[PDB]
């Protein structure tokens, strides 16, 4: 029945009580085969000319370190984020996935998307269960009306033109900023192209199929000409979900 009343009663978030043919999984196999080697580049993204990142990208995953992620433990402001020249490295048809937190980011992240030329097509929520800490209460942002138990990742399309829009995992430990890896599965399952950029990635997010750029990477291997060779003809327009070309 009333899981909101139940949360008031016991401290168990309503999302603790959500439960759970086909097969797919061949799509994952196709993705895995189609993936370019993992590439990565440590770069201070404030100080970095974004335009050295070529070629233009089919997908961009943008995960700027917001102050709100450091509740109990350089942060970027939405002022800083807005000034990124994201449109200078996006392909004319391309997609963006932006982690917006759960406060003013839900509005300012929309402003960013419009500033860079996308329209929002999906609102993906990461819902945090607290099954292992019903006791731990939440320190509220002054403006908050409710306890904030979720983060939003916004999807954006620019140009001309399966999974659910929810991710449910347990709330990470205090100070752990990692977003759920499932976002990568959602993104890859869209089959949007093979040029995938992850800005503000980390040593721990590097992944095949992706180019990771971020200030805390300890190693770099990115080379714009090596990277461009993975998409030269005849591979220019693979979705990322088809067989390689012999």
């Amino acid at each position: 029945n009333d899981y909101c009343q139940h949360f008031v009663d016991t401290g168990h978030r309503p999302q603790n009580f959500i439960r759970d043919r086909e097969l797919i999984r061949l799509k994952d196999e196709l993705i895995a085969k189609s993936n370019t080697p993992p590439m990565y580049l440590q770069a201070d993204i404030e100080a970095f000319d974004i335009r050295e990142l070529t070629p233009k990208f089919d997908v961009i995953l943008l995960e700027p370190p917001l102050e709100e992620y450091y509740r109990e433990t350089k942060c970027w402001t939405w002022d800083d984020i807005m000034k990124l020249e994201i449109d200078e490295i996006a392909a004319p048809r391309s997609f963006i996935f932006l982690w917006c937190g759960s406060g003013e980011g839900l509005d300012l992240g929309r402003v960013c998307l419009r500033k860079w030329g996308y329209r929002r097509c999906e609102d993906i929520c990461w819902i945090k269960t607290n099954k292992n800490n019903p006791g731990k209460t939440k320190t509220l942002d002054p403006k908050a009306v409710f306890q904030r138990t979720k983060e939003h990742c916004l999807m954006g399309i620019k140009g001309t033109v399966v999974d659910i829009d929810l991710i449910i995992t347990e709330e990470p430990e205090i100070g752990n900023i990692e977003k759920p890896v499932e976002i990568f599965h959602i993104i890859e399952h869209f089959c949007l192209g093979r040029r995938r950029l992850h800005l503000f990635g980390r040593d721990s997010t590097i992944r095949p199929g992706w180019l990771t750029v971020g200030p805390t990477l300890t190693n770099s291997n990115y080379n714009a000409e090596t990277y461009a060779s993975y998409f030269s003809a005849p591979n220019s327009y693979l979705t990322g979900c088809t067989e390689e070309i012999e």
């Binding site: 949360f7 309503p14 999302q15 759970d20 097509c121 609102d123 409710f146 306890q147 829009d165 929810l166």
Partner: protein, 202 residues
């Protein structure tokens, strides 16, 4: 008064100034996202007279599709800051989960603040509702508990509600309600003065 109250009307044409001030406003509008009978265009939405209904308190605004952006616009136009955003995860009777890119598992309701609301129990509930789909187009009754716990005993107003939404402490407006049912004496007085024959025209 306290028990359910309501007004069948065209919310575009009602003079809501007769209704007084409310601690909580809730609206589940017929956005023109896909034009069914009852839908409002974006300018009509924009020109609703929300700003007279509150001095200090909260607004709850259900949004979907592109009204996620448009409702943010009306919300700000009407004088509110968006300070929270509730999601209702839609489950079946066994608590399993039931936009052309991803299937939708949830519904969104913006929460807006106006003025400095004082005396509210901010932080009792959390921003996720997990509840069971009744009839389609029904909102979950859980939202009324969260609102009552947040602002207990206060005046509330719902816009575009249906007969199943009528609640103690609330005045429900909608065009599929069954006539006018008003108990609060201040409201009954102003309604009589403004509508001496009981019609609601221009």
């Amino acid at each position: 008064l306290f028990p359910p109250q309501w007004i069948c009307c065209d919310i575009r044409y009602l003079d809501v100034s007769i209704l007084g001030k409310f601690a909580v406003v809730m609206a589940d509008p017929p956005w023109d996202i896909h034009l069914p009978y009852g839908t409002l265009t974006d300018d009509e939405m924009r020109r609703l007279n929300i700003p007279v209904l509150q001095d200090d308190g909260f607004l709850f605004l259900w949004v979907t599709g592109r009204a996620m952006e448009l409702g943010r616009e009306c919300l700000n136009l009407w004088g509110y800051e968006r300070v929270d955003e509730i999601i209702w995860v839609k489950t079946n009777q066994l608590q399993r989960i039931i936009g052309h890119w991803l299937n939708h598992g949830k519904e969104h309701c913006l929460v807006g603040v106006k003025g400095n609301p004082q005396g509210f129990n901010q932080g009792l509930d959390c921003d996720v509702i997990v509840a069971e789909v009744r009839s389609t187009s029904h909102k979950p009754d859980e939202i009324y508990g969260m609102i009552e716990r947040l602002s207990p005993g206060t005046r509330k107003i719902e816009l575009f509600g249906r007969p199943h939404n009528v609640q103690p402490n609330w005045i429900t407006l909608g065009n599929q309600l069954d006539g006018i049912h008003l108990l609060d004496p201040d409201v009954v007085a102003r309604f009589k003065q403004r509508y001496p024959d009981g019609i609601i025209s221009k």
